[PDB]
Enzyme design. Structure first.
Site, short mmCIF file in Angstrom:
data_model
loop_
_atom_site.label_atom_id
_atom_site.label_comp_id
_atom_site.label_asym_id
_atom_site.label_seq_id
_atom_site.Cartn_x
_atom_site.Cartn_y
_atom_site.Cartn_z
N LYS B 159 0.83 -1.20 0.00
CA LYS B 159 0.00 0.00 0.00
C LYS B 159 0.86 1.26 0.00
CE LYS B 159 -3.91 0.00 2.07
NZ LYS B 159 -5.26 0.38 2.56
N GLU B 185 -3.87 9.61 12.16
CA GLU B 185 -2.57 9.07 11.79
C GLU B 185 -1.83 8.60 13.03
OE1 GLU B 185 -1.71 8.34 8.98
OE2 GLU B 185 0.46 8.38 8.68
N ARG B 186 -1.38 7.35 13.02
CA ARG B 186 -0.51 6.86 14.07
C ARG B 186 0.83 7.58 13.98
NH1 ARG B 186 -2.72 2.60 11.51
NH2 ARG B 186 -4.29 1.38 12.64
N1 LIG Z 1 6.73 -2.71 -6.69
C1 LIG Z 1 7.47 -3.33 -5.75
N2 LIG Z 1 8.67 -3.87 -6.04
C2 LIG Z 1 9.42 -4.49 -5.10
N3 LIG Z 1 9.03 -4.61 -3.82
C3 LIG Z 1 7.84 -4.12 -3.39
C4 LIG Z 1 6.98 -3.43 -4.36
N4 LIG Z 1 5.88 -3.05 -3.69
C5 LIG Z 1 6.02 -3.45 -2.40
N5 LIG Z 1 7.20 -4.09 -2.23
C6 LIG Z 1 7.67 -4.66 -0.94
O1 LIG Z 1 6.54 -5.02 -0.14
C7 LIG Z 1 6.62 -4.45 1.17
C8 LIG Z 1 5.29 -3.80 1.52
O2 LIG Z 1 5.49 -2.77 2.48
P1 LIG Z 1 4.77 -1.34 2.29
O3 LIG Z 1 4.86 -0.99 0.83
O4 LIG Z 1 5.33 -0.40 3.34
O5 LIG Z 1 3.24 -1.65 2.65
P2 LIG Z 1 2.72 -1.60 4.17
O6 LIG Z 1 3.15 -0.23 4.64
O7 LIG Z 1 1.23 -1.77 4.03
O8 LIG Z 1 3.44 -2.75 4.84
C9 LIG Z 1 7.78 -3.46 1.16
O9 LIG Z 1 8.67 -3.73 2.25
C10 LIG Z 1 8.48 -3.63 -0.17
O10 LIG Z 1 9.82 -4.09 0.01
#
Ligand SMILES: Nc1ncnc2c1ncn2[C@@H]1O[C@H](COP(=O)(O)OP(=O)(O)O)[C@@H](O)[C@H]1O
Ligand SMILES: Nc1ncnc2c1ncn2[C@@H]1O[C@H](COP(=O)(O)OP(=O)(O)OP(=O)(O)O)[C@@H](O)[C@H]1O
Ligand SMILES: Nc1ncnc2c1ncn2[C@@H]1O[C@H](COP(=O)(O)OP(=O)(O)O)[C@@H](O)[C@H]1O
Ligand SMILES: [Mg+2]
Ligand SMILES: [Mg+2]
Lengths: 99, 464, 48, 49, 469, 49, 468
Positions: B159, B185-186
């Site tokens: 997300k 927001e946390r």
């Molecule tokens: N397009 C992408 N390419 C590579 N890795 C991704 C991609 N999208 C998400 N990720 C990985 O998935 C994980 C999801 O974390 P995040 O994006 O912060 O979502 P949330 O905050 O909901 O956990 C991240 O740590 C990231 O490394």
């Protein structure tokens, strides 16, 4: 809040703190009793309009401080007693959204 | 002409004024707490005129330490937030105070957060599609320019990376800007978002407005209006396309309900404020396209008890235009973005808007994916060999299609060396049409991971 | 084969039953919240 | 009621009128909000009697 | 002089201040004047409460829009009265007694106050004479009582009004007595349709119609039933003539009472209803009753809000009835007309003492079969019929045929389907359902039993389908 | 209470009494109506405490 | 210096006193009803100081016949009840008046019924099993000597019968003092208990305090405090082991809620007083053993409308060491005592206190019953033949186990004509180990219904043609 203050003293001094609240639902019940006895307007389950605030301001004091402030931390372990596994009740919903 | 505090009941404060100086509704008044430990300046929002020159106000900060009779100053205007290009790359609270640099923005132009939606004649009577460059979104669930998109997704399904990608795309493919509104927001997550956007280098293109969870309900109720005011300034004065983020809109509704309860108003069905729909409409009708410039809004929606008929989600969905479900299952496959092609939806995915061919290709993709999802359980338990050759080839086709729905995002560069890709809508439609026809089954599955158009597909085909 | 068809039908009927029951349960949940609030506010008004 | 009065003017002049209310659910919600703000006791689904 | 003045106006409710010693009695009619152009009229206020300080709270019968504070209010010295006599028959009146189809008519008639006590308990005598309607389900499972009280419960659009029309056709058509119809908070166009239909059928000359419909203030909607009941009471107690009293809808009387109670400032009861709900309902209902030698057969349609049969209004209404037909949303969904729930409906005269041993036995067997089918619905919704035992499968087939055969092509349904209605004699109904319960028609297809009359219709429809009886 | 008093007179004089209350639901509703009209604070389902 | 009645509204009376003579909170005041039919002396308890020298008070007796402006006299102290060894063998009401001997105990020492709970530093957790001879209780809900035991259940599920059974099993051989508190229950039940204790010769050791459901709310609010005051005297002063039986402790809360709104309190959720938990804690924290001073308390807790999530039982749950939760479903099946094995609990049901064998057998029984509960609807719809062989075996075992948890109770003879039985703990553990191992799967389940130990099982199986 007493426990949070005692822990915060250590947290701001570079220590690491773990705080357990057992249970926050009882705190919410006590605050509701006080608010009703003061005739403040009630909402869902007769809770005042600032019970979510009651729990949120408490729980947001559990933090991981930056290195400037000493790197101390307080880890919160709030405990909530659901009834009939009803996690959509008012207080469980609030605390779930907060943590 | 200053007033004085008469009653203090938690965050609710009554203030008396001289007869001729009663403030207007929603005016921001100032009071001082002088006790050393809690010394601060309270901002009070006039909520009601009680008569006898008394006003009932909601305190934007905890009233602890406030004293009856302290002077109350009237600013003469409602809560005003700073506006301009200077708000980019900075964090503000619901009242327009800078959090990363206190005192910053005090000298900018200030706009009241209470504004009316564009006049009826100034609205755009023709719905328009916002081409993002993402294959899955553009094809299956096209976004509406100036519309509202719900975002659903569990922890760790990309997300945050999706939000970063949308910030990148609005800033790069539209010359626009982003306003993030953290409602409830946390603080941990707010700091994480600040640091992550700074690291990704997109913080320069975004303005963050945090109404945090440890604040009284008033700021949590007004932070969305503050962020929307910044976005409206960008759309109207700078002539930019804005991308507004709201997380969580349900928390805006819940803060409104709490404020209504504090003000002694009789709760409505399921305990929400009587004016739930009115407040939601006031917020959402300002997120629109006007004279060629639009504010598009992606909003995180929490559904109480998973009940989509609950008054809060039911009211919110009346204003939403598209849905994007982030799926744990999809993410676990390595597909990014983890958009659930079957759970997600869009109201403009009809022939009248996206044309006949876009609809036809999207419906074919949906049918294939649905069939594959139906066969997935049989595959897992009884094995692929049980399925017929027709089912086996359909499964291969669907696997290739779902792999090709993934894409190398521009927010993924910080995680992987390769940069992101943009795919024109026509190229996406034709590529997925051909994929459904079965013109690339001979290619291996891995060729379809994290690429853009047909050229990338071909190159990765030779590479493998 | 007929048992497969019958169990598919039964599973779909269970889907429909669960959906209808969840709808009814959510309606009951909302009604209970509303009724509790009505009682609380009526008592509070009686004491106003 | 505004739309109904506008239409009634024509109707009582021998005209034929077609009036669409889109939608009465939201009118009911608005009336309930007004009634609750007036502190009128509500009934089923918090609606006024 | 001695006239009061308006002090408070809160919608239909008005507070009036009178000089000391001139405070009107409860339920007295008072007259005020609205002088604004389009809304100019005379308001009739019924005194409802004495507030002290020579103040009276009153319920307006007409909308109070345009009324001003301080306008003179005159006390008529009595309660609302309506014309009575043979002259009311054939004419349409409103709650206040004004003739609608011919203004000014009936002003010279004897007038009776719409408020009076119910008959003395010593004059009450239970009624147990069966009223044969010709409807299979009603005659078999919920036999109506001549001179008793019948009700038709049902949610929105399940067929209460069509069944009222059916019973007007089946009972009031060839009726030697008088009929009184009370439209209470229902569609006005339904009142016009009833007027025209009664005129066409020549029953109008024996019927008195009183309408207070949806677009009326709650006061009118809660007093129109009293007005019509007063005409019926005159016919019962002064001319000794059997009276038919159709009321549609009495729940609207309860609803208007709830609205008034809200306006009167009374503290609400459960589900927001007036605290006096049962008391108001009883005061109204105990007047609707036969006495020794004087018969009123009353038939009331009761609306069930949100299909909720536990709502306080119908819940309190249930106790005031001798026969209770309950129309069900589920039966209506199946297409069964009349959409009667045979398990929730009841009749006080459905016992072997009154209807005979065979009638009772057949009714009880039908009820038992339908109850077993209702019990088995839980299994059948998931697994269908094929997981049941042979006994249960046979019972389920029999029950489906029975529930289809309880439907009937009604006389009032012709306008909808174009099919003329049918009348089934009670003896034929008992014979036919005895045959069904014994499995003599199990071979016929289910649709053979749908929307037909007696056994001859069953044979014809089965033959047209392909099975021979 | 009237029926109970009549029965109690016989009971306290060595007689055996059988009293049927048909039914106490309606008595409860009547008491609730009286209490609400006296504007006493209601409880569950508007019944008095 | 005397006050005068100003407002009368049911059990709540407002009294105006001259300035400087306003009685303290919880003081007992006296008013007179002079009407011949209802002539009496009302005891009022000061509940609130309304200000302006007015106090709101709760009447301990019906206020019918009370007149406005009558003189109200302040006793200067709270309600106080006689204490000492003289209470044993006698019946008292909430106010300390002897019922079976009017005037008795007026010369005894009188203790105020309002008292703070023991200091936290004197509280020692109790971990000592109290054997009862009831299979289900001893196996799954072992009671604690000196601990707090509750019997939860809806109306008419067997709470009172179980309390009488435990009076028979525990109090009869008890070496110390027993106190029974009838709180808002049936007067006929109180008479039956009085006569039964006299018959068993247990009465001489027992102090009975009754405030029944026909009493006004104030009496039902203070009767538990009176009985607990007597028990507290026996604990602190006499230094003897005390049994405290309370039936029904929910009536204390219910009586509190009855007058809550008349006291001007805004209602909480579910129509309860805002101070539910506070009053309950004030009363319950006094019902405890201290270091070296033992009170084994057993309380019947009514669960309104079988709803275990109701605020009153839910609040009460936290105050107990052992809880036997009776179920309407078990009751309607015909199992007695109608205990819900999956819902009941005990803080000493762990290997350290009860031992490895007892704990393991109890846990296995609970697992089997949980699995059977999960499979019940499957069996209902699809039938038992569509279960696996393991599931079918588990279902047979679970049915036998649930029947064997039932027992012919000593106090249930009047309801079955069958004399009761007592099963030693060792036999219970052994028998349920055998049941969980499947060693009795060859007997009809009917052989396990309302019997004692293994010998009764063998005899009943023989009567049914089976062999054990
Ligand atoms: N397009 C992408 N390419 C590579 N890795 C991704 C991609 N999208 C998400 N990720 C990985 O998935 C994980 C999801 O974390 P995040 O994006 O912060 O979502 P949330 O905050 O909901 O956990 C991240 O740590 C990231 O490394
Ligand atoms: N016997 C019948 N045969 C065919 N259609 C019928 C029959 N009874 C009712 N209907 C259909 O149902 C509609 C509703 O019938 P009716 O007006 O009698 O219902 P109701 O219960 O009085 O409704 P409401 O709550 O709107 O007053 C009729 O217009 C017709 O469409
Ligand atoms: N062990 C038992 N054996 C047979 N019947 C019982 C048993 N326990 C309770 N019952 C039946 O259930 C009824 C309710 O028991 P009781 O404890 O008096 O009610 P409550 O649980 O409300 O206190 C008893 O009167 C009795 O008929
Ligand atoms: Mg109708
Ligand atoms: Mg009992």
């Amino acid at each position: 809040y007493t426990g949070s203050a005692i822990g915060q003293h250590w947290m701001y001094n570079g220590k690491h703190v773990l705080i357990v609240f057992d249970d926050l639902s009882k705190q919410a019940d006590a605050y509701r009793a006080i608010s009703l006895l003061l005739r403040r307007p009630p909402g869902r389950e007769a809770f005042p309009g600032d019970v979510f605030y009651l729990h949120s301001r408490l729980l947001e004091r559990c933090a991981k401080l930056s290195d400037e402030l000493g790197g101390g931390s307080m880890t919160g372990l709030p405990i909530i007693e659901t009834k009939a596994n009803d996690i959509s009740a008012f207080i469980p919903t609030n605390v779930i959204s907060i943590t | 002409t200053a007033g004085r505090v008469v009653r203090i009941t938690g965050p609710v404060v009554d203030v008396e004024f001289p007869r001729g100086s009663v403030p207007e509704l929603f005016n921001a008044l100032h009071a001082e707490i002088t006790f050393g430990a809690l010394a601060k300046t309270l901002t009070l929002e006039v909520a009601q005129h009680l008569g006898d020159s008394l006003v009932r106000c909601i305190s934007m900060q905890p009233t602890d330490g406030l004293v009856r009779g302290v002077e109350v100053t009237d600013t003469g205007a409602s809560i005003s937030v700073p506006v301009g290009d200077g708000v980019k790359g900075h964090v503000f609270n619901a009242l327009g105070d800078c959090l990363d640099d206190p005192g910053y923005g005090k000298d900018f132009e200030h706009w009241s957060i209470h504004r009316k939606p564009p006049a009826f004649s100034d609205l755009e009577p023709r719905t328009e599609m916002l081409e993002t460059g993402l294959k899955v979104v553009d094809l299956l669930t096209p976004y509406v320019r100036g519309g509202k998109i719900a975002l659903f997704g569990g922890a760790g399904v990309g997300k945050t990376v999706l939000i970063q990608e949308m910030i990148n795309r609005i800033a790069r493919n539209f010359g626009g800007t982003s306003v993030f509104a953290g409602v409830g927001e946390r603080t941990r997550e707010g700091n994480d978002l600040w640091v992550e956007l700074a690291d990704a280098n997109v913080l320069k293109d975004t303005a963050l407005v945090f109404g945090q969870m440890d604040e009284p309900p008033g700021t949590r109720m007004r932070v969305a209006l503050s962020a929307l005011t910044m976005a409206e300034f960008f759309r109207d004065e700078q002539g930019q396309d804005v991308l507004l983020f709201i997380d969580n809109i349900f928390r805006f509704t819940q803060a409104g309900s709490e404020v209504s309860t504090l003000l002694g108003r009789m709760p409505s069905a399921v305990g929400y404020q009587p004016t739930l729909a009115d407040e939601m409409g006031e917020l959402q009708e300002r997120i629109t396209s006007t004279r060629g410039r639009s504010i598009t809004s992606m909003q995180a929606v929490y559904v109480p008890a998973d009940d989509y008929t609950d008054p809060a989600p039911a009211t919110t969905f009346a204003h939403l235009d598209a849905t994007t479900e982030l799926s744990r299952a999809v993410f676990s496959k390595g597909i990014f973005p983890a958009v659930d092609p079957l759970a997600s939806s869009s109201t403009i995915l009809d022939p009248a808007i996206v044309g006949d061919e876009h609809y036809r290709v999207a419906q074919e993709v949906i049918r294939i994916l649905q069939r594959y999802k139906d066969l997935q359980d049989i595959i897992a338990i009884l094995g692929i060999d049980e399925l017929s050759e027709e089912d086996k080839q359909l499964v291969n086709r669907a696997r290739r299609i779902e792999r090709f729905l993934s894409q190398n995002m521009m927010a993924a560069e910080q995680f992987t060396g390769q940069p992101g890709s943009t795919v024109p809508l026509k190229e996406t439609i034709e590529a997925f049409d051909k994929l459904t026809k079965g013109e690339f089954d001979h290619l291996p599955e891995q060729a379809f991971f994290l690429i853009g158009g047909l050229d990338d597909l071909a190159k990765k085909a030779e590479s493998l | 084969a007929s048992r497969r068809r019958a169990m598919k039908s039964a599973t779909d009927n269970a889907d429909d039953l669960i959906k209808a029951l969840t709808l009814a349960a959510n309606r009951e949940r909302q009604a209970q919240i509303t009724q509790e609030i009505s009682e609380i506010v009526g008592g509070a008004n009686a004491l106003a």
